[PDB]
């Protein structure tokens, strides 16, 4: 009975984990992925789309698509859709709802209890909105854990000396959260935070798209930003291009017959993006992280040599550009690998759900 799911109710992507005999296992979506886009869309027929199909229709159904609702949880923010205003609690509850339903299917049982994580900078109103979202989704929020806390829990960071210094570098899709933590008897307390609420993987992908458009245009003279379908697959290509460059030095973008030019000539986007070019481009954004990393270090008065452990969360931290930056940032103090960065927080949450009960 102690076990329950942990939910990483993320800004752009949410993840569910569950303790199975004490072993946190990340729950897969009905869509075939363990990572669920934190998007809730109302198709123009009264149909609730949560996750990837909400993402798929977002560009055409922006009218009724809510993305990154998490950014407004502590407010009175609501979207009036066909007679009903959906408050940020309710919208995020729909995520939780989908996530609950898949976990139910996965597990073959109804899990009512859950730890849901929130960013360390969320205030209690924002945490209460999260609790409310949980209750709306039929979840009984056991506790809310800060995402940095959960991240440290995920790696089982129980130092034999109790007291431990954690740097948690969170580069998610749409947000950047830096946090220094103090661990004591399984409790991971926050000492300082900083970050950039508008920097994440979305901008790194976006620069790849921009590059693709710029090079396409450079060759054909066509503004691909004017065609939404061009832009959706450019984002898919960009996403995967970044992913490939997390290990490869080069990746190939292949989007044939994208759109229509003046002469109806075959417009095949065929581009080679090197990891070096990728950095030449994206370092405009990688450099934005250096300042808030340092501001946490400065706010606590704790040098990098005094950090016992570094935790990287957010899938964008899988990039070697980020990894090497972390190595400079932390004096070579090596980030702990073994849990997927996007799943880390969910893992910790699941763990706290068992510890807690």
Q: How does 6-36 read in b/e, with b if 16+ C-beta sit within 10 Å?
A: bbbbbbbbbbbbbbeeeebbbbbbebeebbb
Three-state helix/strand/coil letters over 277-293: HHHHHHHHHHHHHHHHH
Distance CA 43, CA 283 (A): 38
Tokens of 136: 């709306």
Cα separation, 26 vs 154, whole angstroms: 12
Active site residues: 8, 70, 147, 170
Discontinuities in the chain (C→N > 2.5 Å), after residue:
none
Query: Is 345:150 a contact under the CB 8 Å cutoff?
Result: yes
Report the C-alpha gap between 322 and 326 in whole angstroms.
Answer: 6
DSSP 3-state assignment of 235? helix
Q: What radius of gyration do the chain's Cα atoms show? A: 21
Closest among 340, 353, 311, 339 to 116, alpha carbons compared? 353
How open is the CA angle 183-187-190, to the nearest 5 degrees? 65
The enclosing H or E element of 143 equals strand 140-146
CA distance 160 to 305: 19
CB 345 within 8 A of CB 9: no
Q: b or e along 293-307 (b: 16 or more beta carbons within 10 Å of the residue's beta carbon)?
A: beebbeebebebeeb
């Amino acid at each position: 009975m102690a076990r329950a799911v942990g939910i990483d109710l993320g800004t752009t992507n949410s993840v569910v984990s569950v303790l199975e005999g004490g072993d946190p296992v990340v729950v897969a979506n009905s869509e075939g992925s363990r990572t669920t886009p934190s998007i809730v869309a109302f198709a123009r027929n009264g149909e609730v789309l949560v996750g990837q199909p909400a993402k798929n229709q977002a560009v055409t159904n922006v009218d009724r698509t809510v993305r990154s609702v998490k950014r407004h949880m502590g407010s009175d923010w609501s979207i009036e859709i066909d007679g009903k205003k959906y408050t940020a609690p309710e919208i995020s509850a729909r995520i939780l709802m989908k996530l609950k339903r898949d976990a139910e299917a996965y597990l073959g049982e109804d899990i009512t209890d859950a730890v849901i994580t929130t960013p360390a900078y969320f205030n209690d109103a924002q945490r209460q909105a999260t609790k409310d979202a949980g209750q709306i989704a039929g979840l009984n929020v056991l506790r809310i854990v800060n995402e940095p806390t959960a991240a440290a829990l995920a790696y089982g960071l129980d130092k034999g000396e109790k007291e431990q210094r954690i740097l948690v570098f969170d580069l998610g899709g749409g947000t950047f959260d830096v946090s220094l933590l103090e661990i004591g008897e399984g409790v991971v307390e926050v000492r300082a935070t900083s970050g950039d609420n508008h920097l994440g993987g979305d901008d790194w992908d976006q620069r790849v798209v921009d590059w693709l458009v710029d090079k396409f245009k450079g060759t054909s003279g066509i503004d691909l930003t004017k065609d939404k379908m061009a832009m959706q697959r450019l984002r898919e290509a960009a996403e995967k291009a970044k992913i490939e460059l997390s290990s490869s030095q080069s990746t190939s973008i292949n989007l044939p017959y994208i759109t229509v030019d003046a002469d109806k000539n075959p417009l095949f986007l065929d581009e080679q993006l090197t990891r070096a070019e990728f950095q030449r481009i994206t370092q405009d954004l990688l450099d934005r992280t250096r300042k808030p990393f340092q501001s946490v270090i400065a706010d606590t008065g704790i040098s990098v040599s005094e950090i016992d452990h570094v935790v990287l969360v957010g899938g964008s931290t899988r990039m070697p550009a980020v990894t090497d930056l972390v190595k400079e940032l932390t004096g070579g103090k090596e980030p702990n690998k073994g849990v997927n960065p996007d799943e880390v927080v969910a893992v910790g949450a699941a763990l706290q759900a068992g510890v807690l009960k």
